[PDB]
Amino acid sequence: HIDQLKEREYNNYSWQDLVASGVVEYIDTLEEETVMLAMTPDDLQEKEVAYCSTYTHCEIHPSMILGVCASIIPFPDHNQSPRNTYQSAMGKQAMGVYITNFHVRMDTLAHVLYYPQKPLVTTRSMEYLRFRELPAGINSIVAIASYTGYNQEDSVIMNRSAVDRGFFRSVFYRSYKEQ
Amino acid sequence: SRHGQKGTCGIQYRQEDMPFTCEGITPDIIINPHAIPSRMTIGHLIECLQGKVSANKGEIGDATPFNDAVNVQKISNLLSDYGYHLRGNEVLYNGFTGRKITSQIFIGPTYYQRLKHMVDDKIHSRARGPIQILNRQPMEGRSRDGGLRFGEMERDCQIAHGAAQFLRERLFEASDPYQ
Amino acid sequence: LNGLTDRDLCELNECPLDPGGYFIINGSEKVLIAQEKMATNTVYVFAKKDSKYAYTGEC
Amino acid sequence: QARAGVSQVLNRLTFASTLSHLRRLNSPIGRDGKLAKPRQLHNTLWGMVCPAETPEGHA
Amino acid sequence: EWNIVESEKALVAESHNMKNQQMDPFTRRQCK
């Protein structure tokens, strides 16, 4: 299956063939009540003192529990869970290029960041969110330092020379209508 | 940040004024360390650490949540192959004096987001703007050239002060004077 | 905009990345938020102890 | 007498907000609710619902 | 295409690096 699925597009094979071949299965929350579920193929299906030895299913990748905004967090597992929540929320406020045809749009408010960048540290699941095509942020050379107090309490000190070079520069479009 | 580390730009320094490494790599953003310990956003540090590896190895790093081939010793051993401190720390010269900072600053590339909440859409101020037609007090809102509410909670705080002339000014003379 | 190529989407001045799934209503993009509800046709049992009932079965 | 806010204006601020507005779920339970049992992260959201993406407000 | 090549010739390293499983900073559940 991995060999046929790696060679997709160059041949007609697809996800539905894993379904039709009986390899993967859609399991409802109400049916997930009855599965005996592994979390990696190998590591849970080896031979030790027994946990279950009656596994019925395996996870595809445990990072699929995450949503859209949460799956852009790098190392979410190294974070205090409320922090991931905050990011989940702020990630919806991040300026980027909001859609590809934005110069045809007359949307009432829009922000386009000048020089948006792809993340330098990405999750594997931010490929499918198409985040590397339409990113919302910049890789900044952050220091974590108590430099001269002005960052002291949830604040940050930015580089003026970087901002002069267009670092985090943006266009705010406002749009008006009348008939 | 990508980790729940919100903050306002507190000041902007030029590249002459920022701290600098043994080469002229000033930070783009400096965040106060006091953000990390209470919040336990370790993922931010790790990201800042891996981003450093990513920029020097010249290949985009992987931050999938539950990976276990990734840890901090492994990243650290990579980092140390490029001639950096294994822990991501560096030796900064102070931008004003030029003197080395006695603390080794944690520094590296991290992805930052600009949020839509720009100050120039929130700054507001009033003196004798428009009045509501019904009760002759200031309008609400920033766009309607409105006035701030001196609510009940504010009112209690002035009673507690015994600032009764101010109370009657905010509640009579600077609001809706009549005869 | 269905089964339609990147070339054609670009020629319509429309995004190939746009997911879909929303309505245009007076030139506004509208989404229907998926409202959750208790499942139909399925018996449940609860304790509304705050009443004449020790237990209530529901359908 | 109706349900409200079921249709909403699609959020065109960033791609990640577009994508996330289209996959949003909403609870019918009213506000002015002092009850927590509907606001809690249930064991059974695993893999179905993001255990991270929620509003920090009253919602 | 080279990421397919890169990722397959890389992840076999977790099968080849057989001698030294020792390092600490990672854990996993072992129930019952």
Partner: peptide
């Protein structure tokens, strides 16, 4: 073959294909 310990490569191929077949908004 029934025993690939190549899995953090194989895994994301089934992910990619899920996402090629069904978009993100398929549910709508």
């Amino acid at each position: 073959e029934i025993t690939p310990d190549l899995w953090q490569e194989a895994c994301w191929i089934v992910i990619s294909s899920y996402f090629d077949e069904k978009g993100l908004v398929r549910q709508q």
